[PDB]
UniProtKB/Swiss-Prot annotation:
It comes from Homo sapiens. The keyword Thylakoid does not apply. Changing residue 83 to A: Abolishes binding to N6-methyladenosine (m6A)-containing RNAs. Abolishes binding to m6A-containing mRNAs. Changing residue 123 to F: Reduced binding affinity for N6-methyladenosine (m6A)-containing RNAs by 9-fold. It comes from the Eukaryota. The chain holds residues 345 to 507 of 727 of the full protein. Transmembrane segments: none annotated. GO terms for cellular component: nuclear speck; nucleoplasm; nucleus; plasma membrane. Keywords: Isopeptide bond, mRNA processing, mRNA splicing, Nucleus, Phosphoprotein, RNA-binding, Ubl conjugation. This is YTH domain-containing protein 1. The gene is YTHDC1. Changing residue 19 to A: Does not affect ability to influence alternative splice site selection. GO terms for molecular function: mRNA binding; N6-methyladenosine-containing RNA reader activity; RNA binding. Residues 12-140 form the YTH domain.
């Protein structure tokens, strides 16, 4: 069901994460971490202290899809992660959906914080407005392997 998901998304902040390869999103899915460049690190750190939930939505560049989304559980903090690359600290994340979603299913969603361009268009780190980000997350296929009870307890 979607109800606990809606609870987690309530008044959350959303950010578009662009990755240039699948290897890094596979590592993120496996180890519950992410790292980004400092301009985005400072944005995410400010947003983490600001909101009940800060959601990253992942897209690998040239794939035509989003690869899932996750929730910040930490601020960035400085075991070396062997990304396929000046980086910042490491955020710990909790995955809410590890399922893909093709851009063709999100064509009706525009992002007011990026000139109302379709939500798939955006620089790495681009913030997604509340309602667009919420509906984008609800578009993903339900990930039956994930239990949001643990995640709700961290709010």
């Amino acid at each position: 069901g979607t109800s606990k998901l809606k609870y987690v998304l309530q008044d959350a902040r959303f950010f578009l994460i662009k990755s240039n390869n699948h290897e890094n999103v596979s590592l993120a899915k496996a180890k519950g971490v992410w790292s980004t460049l400092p301009v985005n690190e400072k944005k995410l750190n400010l947003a983490f202290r600001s909101a009940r939930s800060v959601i990253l939505i992942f897209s690998v560049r040239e794939s035509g899809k989003f690869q899932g989304f996750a929730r910040l559980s930490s601020e960035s903090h400085h075991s070396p992660i062997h990304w396929v690359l000046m980086l910042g600290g490491v955020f710990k994340i909790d995955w809410i959906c590890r399922r893909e979603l093709p851009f063709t299913k999100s064509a009706h969603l525009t992002n007011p914080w990026n000139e109302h361009k379709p939500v798939k268009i955006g620089r790495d780190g681009q913030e997604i407005e509340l309602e667009c980000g919420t509906q984008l997350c609800l578009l993903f296929p339900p990930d039956e392997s994930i239990d949001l009870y643990q995640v709700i307890h961290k709010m």
